Structures are given as C-alpha cells and as structure tokens.
Amino acid sequence: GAIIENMSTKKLCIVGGILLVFQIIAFLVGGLIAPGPTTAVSYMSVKCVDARKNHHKTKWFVPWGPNHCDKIRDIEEAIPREIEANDIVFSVHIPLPHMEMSPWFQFMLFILQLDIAFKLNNQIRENAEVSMDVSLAYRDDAFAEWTEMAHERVPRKLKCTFTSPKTPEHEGRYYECDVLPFMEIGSVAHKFYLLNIRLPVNEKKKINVGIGEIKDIRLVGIHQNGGFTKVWFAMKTFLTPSIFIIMVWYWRRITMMSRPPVLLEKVIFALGISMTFINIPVEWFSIGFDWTWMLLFGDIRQGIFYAMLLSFWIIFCGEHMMDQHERNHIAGYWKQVGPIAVGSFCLFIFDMCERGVQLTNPFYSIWTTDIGTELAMAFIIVAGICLCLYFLFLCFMVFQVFRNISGKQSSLPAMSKVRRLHYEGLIFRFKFLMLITLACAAMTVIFFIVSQVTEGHWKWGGVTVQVNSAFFTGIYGMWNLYVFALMFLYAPSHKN
Amino acid sequence: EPAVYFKEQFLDGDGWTSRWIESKHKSDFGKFVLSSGKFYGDEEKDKGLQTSQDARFYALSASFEPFSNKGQTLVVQFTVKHEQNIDCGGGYVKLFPNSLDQTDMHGDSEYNIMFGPDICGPGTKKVHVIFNYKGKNVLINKDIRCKDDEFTHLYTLIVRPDNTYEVKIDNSQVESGSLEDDWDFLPPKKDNPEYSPDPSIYAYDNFGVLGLDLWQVKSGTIFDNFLITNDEAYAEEFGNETWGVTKAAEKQMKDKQDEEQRLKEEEEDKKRK
Amino acid sequence: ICNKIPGLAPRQRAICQSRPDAIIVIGEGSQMGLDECQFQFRNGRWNCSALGERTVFGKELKVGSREAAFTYAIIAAGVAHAITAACTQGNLSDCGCGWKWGGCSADIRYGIGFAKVFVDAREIKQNARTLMNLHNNEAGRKILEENMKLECKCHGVSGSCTTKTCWTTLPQFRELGYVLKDKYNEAVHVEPVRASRNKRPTFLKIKKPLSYRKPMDTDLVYIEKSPNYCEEDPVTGSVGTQGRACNKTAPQASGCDLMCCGRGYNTHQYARVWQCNCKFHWCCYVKCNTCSERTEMYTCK
Ligand SMILES: *[C@@H]1O[C@H](CO)[C@@H](O[C@@H]2O[C@H](CO)[C@@H](O[C@@H]3O[C@H](CO)[C@@H](O)[C@H](O[C@H]4O[C@H](CO)[C@@H](O)[C@H](O)[C@@H]4O[C@H]4O[C@H](CO)[C@@H](O)[C@H](O)[C@@H]4O[C@H]4O[C@H](CO)[C@@H](O)[C@H](O[C@H]5O[C@H](CO)[C@@H](O)[C@H](O)[C@H]5O)[C@@H]4O)[C@@H]3O)[C@H](O)[C@H]2NC(C)=O)[C@H](O)[C@H]1NC(C)=O
Numbered sequence A: 001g002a003i004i005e006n007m008s009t010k011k012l013c014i015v016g017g018i019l020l021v022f023q024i025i026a027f028l029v030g031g032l033i034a035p036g037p038t039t040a041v042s043y044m045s046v047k048c049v050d051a052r053k054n055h056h057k058t059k060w061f062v063p064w065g066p067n068h069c070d071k072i073r074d075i076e077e078a079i080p081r082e083i084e085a086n087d088i089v090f091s092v093h094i095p096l097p098h099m100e101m102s103p104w105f106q107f108m109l110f111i112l113q114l115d116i117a118f119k120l121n122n123q124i125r126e127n128a129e130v131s132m133d134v135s136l137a138y139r140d141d142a143f144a145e146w147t148e149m150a151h152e153r154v155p156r157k158l159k160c161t162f163t164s165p166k167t168p169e170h171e172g173r174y175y176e177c178d179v180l181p182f183m184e185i186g187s188v189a190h191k192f193y194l195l196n197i198r199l200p201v202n203e204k205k206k207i208n209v210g211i212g213e214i215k216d217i218r219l220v221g222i223h224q225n226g227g228f229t230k231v232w233f234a235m236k237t238f239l240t241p242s243i244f245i246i247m248v249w250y251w252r253r254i255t256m257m258s259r260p261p262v263l264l265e266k267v268i269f270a271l272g273i274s275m276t277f278i279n280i281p282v283e284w285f286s287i288g289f290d291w292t293w294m295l296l297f298g299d300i301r302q303g304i305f306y307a308m309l310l311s312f313w314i315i316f317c318g319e320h321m322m323d324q325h326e327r328n329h330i331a332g333y334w335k336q337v338g339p340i341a342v343g344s345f346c347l348f349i350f351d352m353c354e355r356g357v358q359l360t361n362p363f364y365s366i367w368t369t370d371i372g373t374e375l376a377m378a379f380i381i382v383a384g385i386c387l388c389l390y391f392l393f394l395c396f397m398v399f400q401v402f403r404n405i406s407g408k409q410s411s412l413p414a415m416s417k418v419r420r421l422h423y424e425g426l427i428f429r430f431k432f433l434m435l436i437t438l439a440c441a442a443m444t445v446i447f448f449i450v451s452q453v454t455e456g457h458w459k460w461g462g463v464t465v466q467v468n469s470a471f472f473t474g475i476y477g478m479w480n481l482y483v484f485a486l487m488f489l490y491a492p493s494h495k496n
Numbered sequence B: 001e002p003a004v005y006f007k008e009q010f011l012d013g014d015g016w017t018s019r020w021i022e023s024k025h026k027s028d029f030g031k032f033v034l035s036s037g038k039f040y041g042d043e044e045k046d047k048g049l050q051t052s053q054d055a056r057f058y059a060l061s062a063s064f065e066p067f068s069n070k071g072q073t074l075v076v077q078f079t080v081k082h083e084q085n086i087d088c089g090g091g092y093v094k095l096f097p098n099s100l101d102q103t104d105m106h107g108d109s110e111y112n113i114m115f116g117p118d119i120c121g122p123g124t125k126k127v128h129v130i131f132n133y134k135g136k137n138v139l140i141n142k143d144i145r146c147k148d149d150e151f152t153h154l155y156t157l158i159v160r161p162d163n164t165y166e167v168k169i170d171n172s173q174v175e176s177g178s179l180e181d182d183w184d185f186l187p188p189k190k191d192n193p194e195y196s197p198d199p200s201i202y203a204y205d206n207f208g209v210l211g212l213d214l215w216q217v218k219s220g221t222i223f224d225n226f227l228i229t230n231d232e233a234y235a236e237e238f239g240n241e242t243w244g245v246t247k248a249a250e251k252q253m254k255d256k257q258d259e260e261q262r263l264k265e266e267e268e269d270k271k272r273k
Numbered sequence C: 001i002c003n004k005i006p007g008l009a010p011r012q013r014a015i016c017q018s019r020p021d022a023i024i025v026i027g028e029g030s031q032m033g034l035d036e037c038q039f040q041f042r043n044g045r046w047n048c049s050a051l052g053e054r055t056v057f058g059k060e061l062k063v064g065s066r067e068a069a070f071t072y073a074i075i076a077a078g079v080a081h082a083i084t085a086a087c088t089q090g091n092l093s094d095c096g097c098g099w100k101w102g103g104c105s106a107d108i109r110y111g112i113g114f115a116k117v118f119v120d121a122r123e124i125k126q127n128a129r130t131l132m133n134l135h136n137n138e139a140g141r142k143i144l145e146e147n148m149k150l151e152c153k154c155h156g157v158s159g160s161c162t163t164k165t166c167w168t169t170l171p172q173f174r175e176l177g178y179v180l181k182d183k184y185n186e187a188v189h190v191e192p193v194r195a196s197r198n199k200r201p202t203f204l205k206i207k208k209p210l211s212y213r214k215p216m217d218t219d220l221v222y223i224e225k226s227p228n229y230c231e232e233d234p235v236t237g238s239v240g241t242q243g244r245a246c247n248k249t250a251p252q253a254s255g256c257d258l259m260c261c262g263r264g265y266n267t268h269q270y271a272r273v274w275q276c277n278c279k280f281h282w283c284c285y286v287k288c289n290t291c292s293e294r295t296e297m298y299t300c301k
C-alpha cells in the first residue's frame, strides 16, 4: 500500500497547496527574472577584397576596426576596379563592435541569407547549388593573431523563387530565398569569432555557376542569453539537492521493507533517476571548458527522461489492472514498451547523424543532400509511427483499466474490509494519478502552443513578463514537482 | 563552280534528326517537328522544321564543312512560312564558327553573322543583318521590312569581297549597299585622326555551324530550303527551283482552303439564325 | 561637420554634434529615398526631379500634393532603413546596445527612433503643411515597420520546435518603393480643422466626400491639388517636360502625346551601344559584345 491511500483529504490538500505554491514560483522565476531564452543578431557581411595577398599563406580579412579590409560598398564597384570573383571574401565578425561572446551563451547557431538580384540574362538555374569556401577563426583579445577553428567547403542548394513579373521594369529585385542552415557549435569558449566566406567560380567543374547575381550575404547568429543561462543554473542548483534528498528517502523507504519492491516502485525510482540526471548541472562545467558536445548530451538527457516518462505511464496503467494482472515482471510489458524503445533508438540515431557529426564539422547538416533528407525523414517517420502505436496502446490500456474498475465496484460490498480498503485505495491511486497527469500534460501542451504563437513577451503594468522563458521554467518546475509528488505519495506505507 | 557550303531539303524524311543537334543549355527549350503545315505546295518538298510549343525558346543547329569567305562571295539563303502569324517571334538564322559547342547554344552564343526576319509587336517587323566584327555586333542601319502573311517567303543575303552586299527576298532585290556604309564598323571619317580603313570586314576565318536560336510566343512557323554557298547564281536558281515552283500550287491550296472556310462560316451563320 | 551641410534645421545640426557618425548614414538614407522616388516616377510628368539644387533632404515641394506626400514618406523610410542597415554591418557601434544579460534591443527600434527624432525636427513652422509632412513621415516609417520580413528557426531538442528564435529583417528598398507607390496611387485628400480656442489647427480630417474621420496613420495624405507638371512655373514648383524622353505610343503617361501635353516629339538618331551577348559569373566577370544600333529616341518639344 502506498502513502496516498492512507492520507486524509486535509493532508492531500496541504501537499497540493505547497506544490501549487512552488509551481507559481517556478513560473514567476522565468516570467519576471529571466531575460528570454535566445537572442538573434543579424549580421551583414562586409565584401572584403583580396588584392592577391592570400597566395600561399592564409590571410584573415577583418570587417572593421584596426587592420580593416579593403571593401566594396556595393558589388557593382568590382567591375570598374576589374576585381574578379574568387577575391571577394564576405567577412563577418561575430561579436558586433565593442561586445564580447561569453561561455554563458551556451551555443552559437548560425544561418545564412543570400540577397540574389533578379537579372534577365543572369537568372538562377533550375537546380542551382552554392558551394561556399568557408573559413572560421577565434580570438581571445583584440591584439592577438586569429587562430583557425574550421575550414570546410559548404555546398547548399538554393530554394529561391521570384514573385514579381519577369520584366526589365522589375529587374534588380531580390529573389525570395529560404534561409540556409550554416553551422552550430555547442560551445562559445572564445570571445571573438571571424568568419570568411568565398564563392569561387569554375565553369569546367561547375562550381558556383548559375547561382544568380548575389549582392549580399547576411548571417544571423542565435545564442542563449547569459541571463537566462544564469537563471536556469540557479533553478537547477535549487532542484538538484531536493531531488537527491527525496531520492535517498524513497530508496530507504523501498529497501527496508519486509518484502522486495514491486515493478511499479522500481519504475518510479527509474523515473526519479532519469530526472536527477537532468537536474545535475554539468553544463556549469561548460563555462570553464570547451566541450562542444554539450548540446548532444543535453538532448540525450531530455530524450531519456521522455522515454522513461512514457514508459512509466504504460507501466502504471498495466499495474493498475484490477483482475488477473499486475505481474511484477518487466518482460510482460515488451508489447507496450517496445514502441518507446524503437522510437527512442530512431531519434537517437537521427540526433547522432545530425548533431553527432557536427562535432567534427560545424557546417555539416544532414539535410544538404537528398539521400540525407530521405534518411532523416525515415527515422523521424518511424519515430512518429512508434509514438502513434504507443498512444493507441495507452488509450486501450486506460480504457481497459476503467472497465476493470467499473466491473470491480459492484462486487466490493461482498468482500472483507481489508480487501475493500485495498481495492478502494488502488482505485483512488489510479484516478488521482491519471487526473494529475492529464492536468500536467494539458497545461504543458497549452503553454507550448501559447509560447509558439505569442510574440514572446507581454507588457502589463510596470513590468514585462517573458512568456517564452516562463514556459521553460514553469514546465521544468512542473515536471520536477510531478516527480516529487509521484515519489512521495506513491512510496510504500508501513503498517502499525 | 558551285561551292555548296551547306544545303538541305529534308527529302529523306528523317535527316533533320541526324544533321541538326538540339541544344540542352536550358531544360525548357522548345522542340522542332518536321511537318508540311496545314497548307503547302508540295507534301514532301515543303516539309520543314516547325515550332510546336507556345511561349518557348528554340535552339537547334546543323554543322557543315568549315570554310572561309576571304576573297570569295558569300551567300546565305532560306525560306520561312509563318502558319500562325506571330505577334512576336524570330525567324532568323545564325552562323557560328566550328568552335561553338552545339549542345550548349543559347541566346547569348557568339555568332558570326545573324540574318533573317524578326517580328515582335506591330512596332518591329524588320530583317536583321548583324555582323560580329571586332567584338561589336553591329546591326544594319537601313530598315528592311519583312513579310508577314502565312505564305512561304524566301530570304537571301549576299556579301561580296568588294564590301558590297544585297538582300534578296522572294528571289527579288529588297536592299543593297556596302558594308562600311550601312554599319558602324569603322570610326566616322570626319579627316578624323582616329580613322583607318579596313577592307577585311567581310572576311571570316571559318564558318562551321548554322543554328536556329529564336523566341516565339506563337509557335507554328516552318523553316525550309537552307543554302550556304559562294555562288549568287546557284542561290538564285535554287530559290526558283524550290520556292518559285511550289509558289503557284501553295497559293492555289491556300485559296481553296480559305474558300472552304468562308463557305463553312457563311453557311454556319445562315443556319444559326 | 554639419557646418558645411546645407538645409539642416538648427536642432538637427546639434544632433550632428551628438552623433557625427550617424549624420553620414542619414544623408545616405535621404539620398536612397530620393533615388527610389526618382526611379518610381521616372515615367511620369513629375520625375521626382524638381530638385534643381542639392540639399540633404531634397528641395521642398511648394505644393503639398500627392507627390510631396510620396517624397516625404520615402525620405523618412529611407533614413530609418539606412540607419538600421548601417547598424547591422558594424558601421555604427553605439546602435543597439546589458549585452550579456538580454542581448540588446531590436535594431529596427533604434533605427526608427533616431530617424524619427531627426526627420520630424525639420518641420519647424507649425502649419497645416507641417501636419501633412508629419503625417506622411509617420506613414512612411509605419510602412517600413509593416514590411519587415519576419523569420523563425526551430532549434530545440533534436532540432524540433521545442525552442525557436524569431527575428525581423529589413525589406530591400525597391520593394518598399513599390509599396509606397501603391500608397501614392490611392492617397486621400485631407483638410485641416481649426479650433477657435486654440487659434491654430492641430489635427486634420479627410476632405474626400462621404467621410469626416481622421486618416489612418499608415495612409499618405495631401492638402493641395496637383499641378500640371508639364509647363515650367516656379510659382507652383513645376519643372516642365521640355526635352524629356517619350515612347510615342498609346500607353498612358509615357506616350509622347501625354508626356509633352500635346507639344509633339523630337528625334535625333541616338545610336545606342547596347552591350549584349555576355557570359556571366555571379558578380564580376563580363566578356560581352556591344551590339550597337542606330535607334531613334524621341524627346518632348
Ligand atoms: C512603346 O509602347 C508600346 C505600346 O505598348 C510598347 O511596345 C511593346 O514592346 C514590348 C517589347 O517588345 C512588347 O512586349 C513583348 O511581348 C511579347 C508577348 O507578350 C513577349 O514575347 C516579348 O518578349 C520579348 O521581349 C522582352 C523585352 O524585349 C524580352 O525580355 C523577351 O525575352 C523577348 O525578347 C525577344 O523577343 C523577340 C523574339 O523574336 C526578339 O526580337 C527580341 O530581340 C528578343 O530576342 C531575344 O532572345 C532571342 C532568343 O534567342 C535572341 O536571339 C535575341 O538576340 C538576338 O537578337 C538581338 C537583337 O534583337 C541581337 O542583339 C542579338 O545579337 C541576337 O542574338 C534576344 O536576346 C515582349 O515582352 C509589347 O508587345 C509591345 N506592345 C505593343 C506593341 O503594344 C513599348 O512599351 C514601347 N515600344 C518601344 C518600341 O519602345
């Protein structure tokens, strides 16, 4: 028997009130204190000119400041100067003037936008592909030399369309091009970054031919705000000792019984372990070390928690089948836990193929090729099919448990008092956890949709609330409190 | 002697697929077909390349034995029939040196001589005579009005070593002059310090490709009876022996078809009431 | 540096002393706006070239017609666009940004604010004309704001939309010029209204019949009837169409009958050069051949 069957309504209401207070505090921490999850800064690349200086030794072109490159205001000036292609190097300096990058920006995600002008005799080919000769460097202080971080060729397919009528009256207007995913780094260990892009032309090898009339290259740099990272780490620092204390208490509650634990208790402990793995802020070491694999590690942690939560729901429903069921052997749940395992493996493989390869090559992206897109879509579709199978199984099991309960209720008065109380407690357990889980899931989905549609912040009175960050903090606290309440209320009770 | 540099009549029924190469520079280039049209003078002697798709560019060429016109008269001749009466569309032929790649021809290929009628709107109904000279694609100064009706019309260009030229349409003279007078090849004489005579304008080092590179909103035109030769005489007799002999039969055939259409129209108007 | 710059209001010249770097960007923006205005109306009898003398904002139009509304709106939008664009590429440092907590405010907000405080200071004298120019400037800035291209990218757990970031990027100024041309094609006639207690009008309302409300903030307004623009007259700010090109055909406002207002054409064998037949790289390689032709272009008598 759990704790929750024994608890009177007053103690249950007290626990619910405390959890609601902590939920409200979790929402407010993100709403009022946090500055917003991510910041996007748009960079216009400076069209530097290589006056045949980079012959053998690699040279770095700096957009501005001291040692600023010889640059072109608009690319038409290269014709009177007779400056050929293969010399115009688009250069971006990632921190805008008089700013610095810091490790508290937990990642650097870059995209590319091309400004391709429509010209009647210089249109984009049907299957055009641009192959940027990208070079990226880092620096820690403004007086040191640039150090090469990466140097790759980056082919990207152009998805540009032109909406205006194709007449000389509308020549010079830009194509409507989709953004090109450029690169992502899981660490910002350095202060200043320099990015150099070239578009070499070769008719014989068909390199950068027919990509239209490119005027400007615009880079957008997304990073996590330092204030949001600090608030997140404070939240995790609060949550880690709490979950550790409740984990130790639950383990001691489980092991010092006169009987071995049942499967449900082991699954609850496994869910607690999966959440403790998230709560531990190993990302606070990323501010001291250049660990580019932190994004993939965090993704794997989140996926492990999702898989364990989905498994726990089905195990709970199975263990609350009143009649001729509730066997404490995990092997009997391979039918319903199987979809979770297959979907998790497929998503893990997809993440390794996308973010795992990017550790060796920041500019890699699985979608650059048709075959890669097909493979990624195959993994995602298998994961979605497994999710649909899991939800079908979960709905069937919930319906079956409710059918078994409704068939049990009629026979209760004929049973002994002890069995009556046992079955009533099981019914209360199942109903309470199902209602709580439905409330939490509905609120999570509703706030996810709200944050997706809302512009991001709301202005009310003398304060502004960061909705898109209150979402993260509130849901994180919500599921931490869900795990705490599950681990406390469903721990075994001791008779006296 | 009749030095025939190029000549075609399509009497073999499938020679156009063997001697003419379709360009592949762009995916959506239109396709020519070998057809006599809805009306003609001879069923097989007047079967030529017909444009088939509306609002399409066209690119197709045939290679021939390389030759140079240095010190020799050059004659180009061909016939066009506009079955659709284009409101905009070209009907000209381009000559290229053998260095041109026939599979990559497009609207920007460097030709030696461009000649033939061009129509786009009521404003322009002229015959193009363009010479690529020292990097300048000089267009003819005098305006030559081209024919417009559905009937087959013959076009001929003659260039001579003495810098003189003439344009023959329907085996009849329509234009004449000199290369250095009717084009902006040389700087103007006024004595201008920049001036310098150059009698070698007419001479090209090599001709090796004839091509059809034209845009048409209304497809349906037919090209036939090409000729590239050194002899003005053989040009005139050839034009008489293809266009002239078929002219009477073709004209009677159009007249009969128009009479039938008029009869159908008037009887339909009578029966509708 | 603004001692040399003509036409600036005395308060604006103080803003030069405040930000000597930003005045160059504002001048570039005003010139971009005037270039776009000259392109949009190149075929009209008013080619946006009453500017017989050079000022930073262009010579003021004596008649507050639809043309003046378009000019003011395009100038204000160009100033804001240039400020933001120059900020994005590091040509201005103090713009935007604090950085390590919230990552600065949006660039367009700084651009619009500075453009407003600069441009709207030009309307020194209070008058119905000043109200019209302020309305048109705000309409231009609002049209610039409405046309910002929003984009978003999802970068959540496995790349899903669990987390996403959105940003607004400037529209290229030719698109905004066409948008403001469309606004010009449908501008509304307005009239000032004066309160007896105030002794001076403060707001304006629609003059067009079957309406009495205030015009919306994103709609070009005008207070005077447009001149003929084809006879030169400095009393009405008309430059005239004497010597202007014409196509000599039926299409409206470009045919030589309408452009010259019945004075006829004039031809002179212009003989174009017409570079053509090129093989292009994406920016900078050309090997064309000039297909020169003795064409005729017709000018107004
Ligand atoms: C005054 O007002 C009148 C009244 O409205 C207006 O007159 C209008 O004029 C326009 C322009 O022609 C007409 O629009 C046309 O409408 C057609 C149907 O909608 C379109 O098909 C046509 O498209 C052609 O023109 C546009 C712009 O010029 C091009 O972008 C388009 O690609 C088409 O170009 C080809 O059209 C013809 C096809 O035969 C060619 O004659 C023309 O030169 C061009 O050819 C190119 O492509 C071919 C294909 O390979 C090449 O071979 C050509 O190069 C070769 O020839 C050139 C010289 O011609 C040499 O230099 C070169 O060396 C050679 O290789 C070319 O590269 C138009 O959109 C409209 O109908 C008219 N309206 C009327 C009459 O009412 C107009 O506003 C004013 N008129 C004037 C005269 O100013």
Ligand SMILES: [Ca+2]
Binding pocket: B009, B010, B011, B044, B045, B046, B047, B048, B224, B225
């Ligand atoms: Ca034939």
